Short mmCIF file of all heavy atoms in Angstrom, two decimals:
data_model
loop_
_atom_site.label_atom_id
_atom_site.label_comp_id
_atom_site.label_asym_id
_atom_site.label_seq_id
_atom_site.Cartn_x
_atom_site.Cartn_y
_atom_site.Cartn_z
N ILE A 1 -12.07 -1.36 1.98
CA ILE A 1 -13.37 -1.52 1.25
C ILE A 1 -13.11 -1.57 -0.24
O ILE A 1 -13.90 -2.14 -0.98
CB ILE A 1 -14.36 -0.42 1.61
CG1 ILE A 1 -13.87 1.00 1.25
CG2 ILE A 1 -14.82 -0.54 3.06
CD1 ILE A 1 -14.27 1.40 -0.11
N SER A 2 -11.95 -1.06 -0.70
CA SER A 2 -11.57 -1.14 -2.08
C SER A 2 -10.07 -1.09 -2.28
O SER A 2 -9.36 -0.55 -1.45
CB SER A 2 -12.25 -0.11 -2.92
OG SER A 2 -11.98 -0.32 -4.29
N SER A 3 -9.60 -1.60 -3.42
CA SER A 3 -8.18 -1.57 -3.78
C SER A 3 -7.88 -0.26 -4.48
O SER A 3 -6.73 0.00 -4.83
CB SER A 3 -7.85 -2.74 -4.65
OG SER A 3 -8.69 -2.81 -5.76
N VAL A 4 -8.91 0.53 -4.79
CA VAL A 4 -8.67 1.78 -5.49
C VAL A 4 -8.74 2.90 -4.46
O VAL A 4 -9.56 2.82 -3.55
CB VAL A 4 -9.67 1.99 -6.61
CG1 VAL A 4 -9.39 3.28 -7.39
CG2 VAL A 4 -9.75 0.79 -7.54
N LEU A 5 -7.90 3.89 -4.63
CA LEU A 5 -7.77 4.92 -3.61
C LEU A 5 -8.82 6.00 -3.86
O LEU A 5 -9.45 6.47 -2.90
CB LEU A 5 -6.32 5.46 -3.68
CG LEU A 5 -5.89 6.21 -2.41
CD1 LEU A 5 -5.83 5.28 -1.22
CD2 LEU A 5 -4.59 6.92 -2.66
N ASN A 6 -9.04 6.30 -5.14
CA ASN A 6 -10.03 7.32 -5.56
C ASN A 6 -11.42 6.86 -5.12
O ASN A 6 -12.22 7.68 -4.73
CB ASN A 6 -9.89 7.71 -7.00
CG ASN A 6 -8.59 8.46 -7.23
OD1 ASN A 6 -8.14 9.25 -6.41
ND2 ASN A 6 -7.96 8.15 -8.36
N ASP A 7 -11.69 5.54 -5.21
CA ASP A 7 -13.00 5.00 -4.85
C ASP A 7 -13.27 5.29 -3.36
O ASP A 7 -14.39 5.72 -3.08
CB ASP A 7 -13.14 3.56 -5.30
CG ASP A 7 -13.16 3.40 -6.79
OD1 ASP A 7 -13.17 4.40 -7.50
OD2 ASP A 7 -13.15 2.23 -7.25
N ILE A 8 -12.28 5.04 -2.51
CA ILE A 8 -12.42 5.33 -1.06
C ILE A 8 -12.67 6.81 -0.88
O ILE A 8 -13.53 7.19 -0.12
CB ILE A 8 -11.21 4.87 -0.27
CG1 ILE A 8 -11.00 3.35 -0.42
CG2 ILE A 8 -11.32 5.31 1.17
CD1 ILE A 8 -9.71 2.84 0.14
N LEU A 9 -11.86 7.60 -1.56
CA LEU A 9 -11.95 9.07 -1.36
C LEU A 9 -13.30 9.58 -1.82
O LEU A 9 -13.83 10.51 -1.22
CB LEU A 9 -10.82 9.70 -2.16
CG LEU A 9 -9.44 9.54 -1.48
CD1 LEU A 9 -8.36 10.07 -2.40
CD2 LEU A 9 -9.48 10.27 -0.15
N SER A 10 -13.88 8.97 -2.84
CA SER A 10 -15.12 9.44 -3.46
C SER A 10 -16.31 8.85 -2.70
O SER A 10 -17.45 9.24 -2.97
CB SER A 10 -15.16 9.16 -4.94
OG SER A 10 -15.18 7.78 -5.16
N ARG A 11 -16.06 7.91 -1.78
CA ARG A 11 -17.18 7.25 -1.16
C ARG A 11 -17.28 7.64 0.31
O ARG A 11 -18.39 7.85 0.79
CB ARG A 11 -17.21 5.72 -1.39
CG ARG A 11 -17.85 5.39 -2.71
CD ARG A 11 -17.57 3.99 -3.20
NE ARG A 11 -17.81 3.01 -2.17
CZ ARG A 11 -17.39 1.72 -2.20
NH1 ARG A 11 -16.65 1.26 -3.21
NH2 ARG A 11 -17.63 0.91 -1.20
N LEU A 12 -16.14 7.83 0.98
CA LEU A 12 -16.16 8.14 2.41
C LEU A 12 -15.76 9.54 2.71
O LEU A 12 -15.18 10.24 1.86
CB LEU A 12 -15.27 7.11 3.11
CG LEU A 12 -15.72 5.66 3.03
CD1 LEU A 12 -14.89 4.80 3.93
CD2 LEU A 12 -17.20 5.52 3.36
N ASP A 13 -16.13 9.98 3.91
CA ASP A 13 -15.61 11.27 4.49
C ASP A 13 -14.23 11.01 5.09
O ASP A 13 -13.90 9.87 5.35
CB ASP A 13 -16.58 11.74 5.57
CG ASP A 13 -17.83 12.34 4.96
OD1 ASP A 13 -17.77 12.77 3.82
OD2 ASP A 13 -18.88 12.33 5.64
N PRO A 14 -13.38 12.06 5.25
CA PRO A 14 -12.06 11.91 5.82
C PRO A 14 -11.92 11.00 7.06
O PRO A 14 -11.03 10.17 7.07
CB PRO A 14 -11.67 13.35 6.20
CG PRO A 14 -12.42 14.22 5.19
CD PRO A 14 -13.68 13.45 4.88
N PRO A 15 -12.77 11.11 8.10
CA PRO A 15 -12.54 10.31 9.32
C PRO A 15 -12.51 8.80 9.15
O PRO A 15 -11.89 8.10 9.93
CB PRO A 15 -13.78 10.66 10.19
CG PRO A 15 -14.23 11.98 9.66
CD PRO A 15 -13.98 11.92 8.17
N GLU A 16 -13.13 8.32 8.08
CA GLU A 16 -13.24 6.88 7.80
C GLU A 16 -12.34 6.50 6.65
O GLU A 16 -11.72 5.41 6.70
CB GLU A 16 -14.71 6.50 7.57
CG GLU A 16 -15.66 7.05 8.63
CD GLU A 16 -17.10 7.29 8.21
OE1 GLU A 16 -17.36 7.48 6.99
OE2 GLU A 16 -18.00 7.31 9.09
N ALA A 17 -12.24 7.38 5.68
CA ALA A 17 -11.33 7.24 4.55
C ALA A 17 -9.91 7.14 5.09
O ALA A 17 -9.09 6.42 4.48
CB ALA A 17 -11.46 8.35 3.55
N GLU A 18 -9.63 7.80 6.23
CA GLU A 18 -8.30 7.72 6.84
C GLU A 18 -7.97 6.28 7.23
O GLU A 18 -6.87 5.81 6.93
CB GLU A 18 -8.24 8.66 8.04
CG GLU A 18 -6.95 8.49 8.84
CD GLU A 18 -6.63 9.58 9.86
OE1 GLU A 18 -7.50 10.52 10.05
OE2 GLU A 18 -5.57 9.53 10.45
N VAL A 19 -8.95 5.58 7.78
CA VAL A 19 -8.75 4.24 8.26
C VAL A 19 -8.55 3.33 7.07
O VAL A 19 -7.57 2.54 7.07
CB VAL A 19 -9.94 3.74 9.11
CG1 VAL A 19 -9.82 2.28 9.45
CG2 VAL A 19 -10.04 4.58 10.40
N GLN A 20 -9.36 3.48 6.04
CA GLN A 20 -9.29 2.65 4.81
C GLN A 20 -7.93 2.88 4.12
O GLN A 20 -7.28 1.96 3.70
CB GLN A 20 -10.48 2.95 3.91
CG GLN A 20 -11.80 2.62 4.56
CD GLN A 20 -11.98 1.17 4.85
OE1 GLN A 20 -11.75 0.34 4.00
NE2 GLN A 20 -12.44 0.85 6.04
N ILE A 21 -7.54 4.17 4.06
CA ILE A 21 -6.29 4.48 3.39
C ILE A 21 -5.12 4.00 4.21
O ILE A 21 -4.09 3.63 3.63
CB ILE A 21 -6.25 5.93 3.03
CG1 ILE A 21 -7.29 6.27 1.95
CG2 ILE A 21 -4.88 6.38 2.57
CD1 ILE A 21 -7.63 7.72 1.83
N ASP A 22 -5.29 3.94 5.53
CA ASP A 22 -4.21 3.43 6.40
C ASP A 22 -4.00 1.96 6.08
O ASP A 22 -2.87 1.51 6.08
CB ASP A 22 -4.49 3.66 7.84
CG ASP A 22 -4.11 5.06 8.29
OD1 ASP A 22 -3.71 5.86 7.41
OD2 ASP A 22 -4.31 5.37 9.47
N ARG A 23 -5.11 1.28 5.84
CA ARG A 23 -5.06 -0.17 5.49
C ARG A 23 -4.29 -0.32 4.19
O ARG A 23 -3.35 -1.14 4.17
CB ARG A 23 -6.44 -0.77 5.42
CG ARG A 23 -6.99 -1.14 6.80
CD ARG A 23 -8.29 -1.92 6.74
NE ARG A 23 -8.91 -1.84 8.05
CZ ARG A 23 -10.20 -1.86 8.31
NH1 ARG A 23 -11.08 -1.95 7.32
NH2 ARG A 23 -10.63 -1.80 9.55
N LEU A 24 -4.66 0.46 3.20
CA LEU A 24 -4.00 0.36 1.91
C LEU A 24 -2.54 0.71 2.02
O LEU A 24 -1.68 0.07 1.37
CB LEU A 24 -4.68 1.27 0.89
CG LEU A 24 -5.90 0.68 0.22
CD1 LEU A 24 -6.27 1.50 -1.00
CD2 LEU A 24 -5.70 -0.76 -0.15
N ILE A 25 -2.25 1.77 2.77
CA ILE A 25 -0.86 2.26 2.85
C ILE A 25 0.01 1.18 3.49
O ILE A 25 1.08 0.92 2.97
CB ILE A 25 -0.82 3.60 3.62
CG1 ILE A 25 -1.04 4.76 2.63
CG2 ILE A 25 0.47 3.73 4.39
CD1 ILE A 25 -1.23 6.05 3.31
N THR A 26 -0.47 0.65 4.59
CA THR A 26 0.26 -0.41 5.29
C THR A 26 0.56 -1.50 4.27
O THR A 26 1.70 -1.90 4.17
CB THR A 26 -0.53 -0.91 6.50
OG1 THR A 26 -0.47 0.15 7.41
CG2 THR A 26 0.04 -2.18 7.10
N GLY A 27 -0.48 -1.93 3.57
CA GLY A 27 -0.38 -3.05 2.62
C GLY A 27 0.68 -2.75 1.56
O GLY A 27 1.58 -3.55 1.32
N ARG A 28 0.56 -1.60 0.94
CA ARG A 28 1.40 -1.32 -0.23
C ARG A 28 2.81 -1.06 0.22
O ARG A 28 3.76 -1.37 -0.50
CB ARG A 28 0.79 -0.15 -1.04
CG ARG A 28 -0.47 -0.58 -1.73
CD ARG A 28 -1.17 0.70 -2.14
NE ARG A 28 -2.25 0.28 -2.96
CZ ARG A 28 -3.03 1.11 -3.55
NH1 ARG A 28 -2.86 2.41 -3.43
NH2 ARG A 28 -4.01 0.68 -4.30
N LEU A 29 2.97 -0.45 1.41
CA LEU A 29 4.31 -0.12 1.84
C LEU A 29 5.03 -1.43 2.18
O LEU A 29 6.21 -1.55 1.91
CB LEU A 29 4.19 0.81 3.05
CG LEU A 29 5.52 1.19 3.70
CD1 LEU A 29 6.31 2.17 2.84
CD2 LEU A 29 5.26 1.78 5.08
N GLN A 30 4.27 -2.36 2.72
CA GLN A 30 4.85 -3.66 3.10
C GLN A 30 5.31 -4.33 1.82
O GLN A 30 6.39 -4.93 1.77
CB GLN A 30 3.87 -4.51 3.88
CG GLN A 30 4.59 -5.67 4.56
CD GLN A 30 3.64 -6.56 5.32
OE1 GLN A 30 2.62 -6.96 4.84
NE2 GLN A 30 4.02 -6.89 6.55
N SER A 31 4.48 -4.21 0.80
CA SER A 31 4.75 -4.81 -0.50
C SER A 31 6.00 -4.21 -1.12
O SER A 31 6.83 -4.95 -1.67
CB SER A 31 3.53 -4.69 -1.36
OG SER A 31 3.85 -5.19 -2.63
N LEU A 32 6.14 -2.89 -1.00
CA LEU A 32 7.34 -2.27 -1.55
C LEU A 32 8.58 -2.71 -0.80
O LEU A 32 9.63 -2.91 -1.41
CB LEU A 32 7.20 -0.77 -1.47
CG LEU A 32 7.08 -0.07 -2.81
CD1 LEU A 32 7.19 1.41 -2.63
CD2 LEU A 32 8.17 -0.56 -3.77
N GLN A 33 8.49 -2.84 0.51
CA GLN A 33 9.69 -3.19 1.29
C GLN A 33 10.11 -4.56 0.87
O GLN A 33 11.35 -4.84 0.76
CB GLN A 33 9.48 -3.22 2.79
CG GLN A 33 9.75 -1.89 3.46
CD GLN A 33 9.00 -1.81 4.75
OE1 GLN A 33 8.77 -2.79 5.43
NE2 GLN A 33 8.66 -0.60 5.14
N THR A 34 9.16 -5.43 0.61
CA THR A 34 9.42 -6.79 0.18
C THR A 34 10.24 -6.73 -1.08
O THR A 34 11.25 -7.39 -1.20
CB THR A 34 8.13 -7.58 0.01
OG1 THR A 34 7.63 -7.78 1.30
CG2 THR A 34 8.34 -8.93 -0.64
N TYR A 35 9.75 -5.92 -2.01
CA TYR A 35 10.39 -5.84 -3.35
C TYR A 35 11.78 -5.33 -3.22
O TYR A 35 12.67 -5.88 -3.82
CB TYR A 35 9.51 -5.01 -4.27
CG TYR A 35 10.23 -4.60 -5.52
CD1 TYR A 35 10.33 -5.45 -6.61
CD2 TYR A 35 10.85 -3.36 -5.60
CE1 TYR A 35 11.04 -5.07 -7.77
CE2 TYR A 35 11.51 -2.95 -6.73
CZ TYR A 35 11.63 -3.83 -7.82
OH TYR A 35 12.31 -3.45 -8.95
N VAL A 36 11.96 -4.32 -2.39
CA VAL A 36 13.30 -3.75 -2.29
C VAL A 36 14.26 -4.71 -1.64
O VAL A 36 15.44 -4.77 -2.01
CB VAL A 36 13.21 -2.41 -1.53
CG1 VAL A 36 14.62 -1.90 -1.14
CG2 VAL A 36 12.48 -1.39 -2.34
N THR A 37 13.81 -5.45 -0.63
CA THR A 37 14.66 -6.41 0.03
C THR A 37 15.11 -7.48 -0.94
O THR A 37 16.27 -7.80 -1.01
CB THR A 37 13.99 -6.93 1.27
OG1 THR A 37 13.97 -5.84 2.15
CG2 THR A 37 14.68 -8.15 1.88
N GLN A 38 14.11 -8.03 -1.68
CA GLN A 38 14.40 -9.06 -2.66
C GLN A 38 15.44 -8.54 -3.65
O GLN A 38 16.35 -9.26 -4.04
CB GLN A 38 13.20 -9.48 -3.45
CG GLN A 38 12.05 -10.08 -2.63
CD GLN A 38 12.42 -11.34 -1.91
OE1 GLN A 38 12.96 -12.26 -2.53
NE2 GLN A 38 12.11 -11.41 -0.63
N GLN A 39 15.29 -7.26 -4.04
CA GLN A 39 16.12 -6.67 -5.07
C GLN A 39 17.53 -6.49 -4.51
O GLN A 39 18.48 -6.64 -5.29
CB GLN A 39 15.57 -5.40 -5.62
CG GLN A 39 14.43 -5.69 -6.57
CD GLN A 39 14.94 -6.25 -7.86
OE1 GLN A 39 14.76 -7.46 -8.14
NE2 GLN A 39 15.60 -5.43 -8.66
N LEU A 40 17.67 -6.17 -3.23
CA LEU A 40 18.98 -5.99 -2.62
C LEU A 40 19.72 -7.31 -2.67
O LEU A 40 20.88 -7.32 -3.09
CB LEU A 40 18.80 -5.55 -1.19
CG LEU A 40 18.57 -4.08 -1.10
CD1 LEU A 40 18.08 -3.67 0.25
CD2 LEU A 40 19.83 -3.30 -1.49
N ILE A 41 19.04 -8.35 -2.29
CA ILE A 41 19.65 -9.67 -2.24
C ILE A 41 20.01 -10.10 -3.65
O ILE A 41 21.09 -10.61 -3.89
CB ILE A 41 18.71 -10.62 -1.51
CG1 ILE A 41 18.59 -10.21 -0.03
CG2 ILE A 41 19.19 -12.07 -1.67
CD1 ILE A 41 17.38 -10.80 0.63
N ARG A 42 19.10 -9.84 -4.60
CA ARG A 42 19.32 -10.30 -5.94
C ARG A 42 20.48 -9.52 -6.56
O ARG A 42 21.25 -10.07 -7.37
CB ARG A 42 18.06 -10.19 -6.80
CG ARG A 42 18.18 -11.03 -8.08
CD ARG A 42 16.85 -11.07 -8.82
NE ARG A 42 15.79 -11.80 -8.16
CZ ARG A 42 14.72 -11.27 -7.56
NH1 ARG A 42 14.51 -9.95 -7.57
NH2 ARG A 42 13.83 -12.05 -6.96
N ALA A 43 20.60 -8.27 -6.14
CA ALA A 43 21.69 -7.46 -6.69
C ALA A 43 23.01 -7.95 -6.13
O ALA A 43 24.03 -7.84 -6.83
CB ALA A 43 21.49 -6.02 -6.38
N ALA A 44 22.99 -8.41 -4.90
CA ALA A 44 24.20 -8.97 -4.26
C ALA A 44 24.65 -10.20 -5.05
O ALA A 44 25.87 -10.33 -5.33
CB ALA A 44 23.97 -9.31 -2.84
N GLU A 45 23.70 -11.03 -5.45
CA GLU A 45 24.02 -12.22 -6.22
C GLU A 45 24.64 -11.83 -7.58
O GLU A 45 25.60 -12.46 -8.01
CB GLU A 45 22.73 -13.03 -6.40
CG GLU A 45 22.88 -14.26 -7.24
CD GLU A 45 21.69 -14.66 -8.14
OE1 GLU A 45 20.55 -14.44 -7.72
OE2 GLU A 45 21.94 -15.15 -9.27
N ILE A 46 24.05 -10.80 -8.19
CA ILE A 46 24.53 -10.36 -9.51
C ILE A 46 25.93 -9.73 -9.36
O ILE A 46 26.73 -9.92 -10.25
CB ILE A 46 23.51 -9.42 -10.16
CG1 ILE A 46 22.34 -10.26 -10.65
CG2 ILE A 46 24.12 -8.63 -11.30
CD1 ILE A 46 22.74 -11.43 -11.49
#
């Protein structure tokens, strides 16, 4: 429902905020793994 974590926390109760935060967590964690993998490969090149 939002890209901000505090907004979800301030708008929903735990049972639903959990789902929203799971969405964000999945998204951001995937994004970090992407970055780390790219960095591993780039470091290999360097």
Side-chain angles (χ1 to χ4, degrees):
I1 61 91
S2 186
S3 56
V4 184
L5 198 66
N6 293 322
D7 294 353
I8 297 170
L9 284 174
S10 64
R11 275 164 51 194
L12 296 189
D13 285 337
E16 310 153 337
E18 172 166 6
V19 172
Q20 301 294 312
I21 291 164
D22 279 1
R23 277 187 198 150
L24 277 196
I25 271 170
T26 289
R28 290 164 171 184
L29 177 72
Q30 195 180 48
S31 175
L32 249 189
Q33 268 156 32
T34 290
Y35 164 83
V36 169
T37 289
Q38 300 296 312
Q39 284 288 108
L40 278 165
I41 293 160
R42 197 174 291 109
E45 176 216 324
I46 286 308

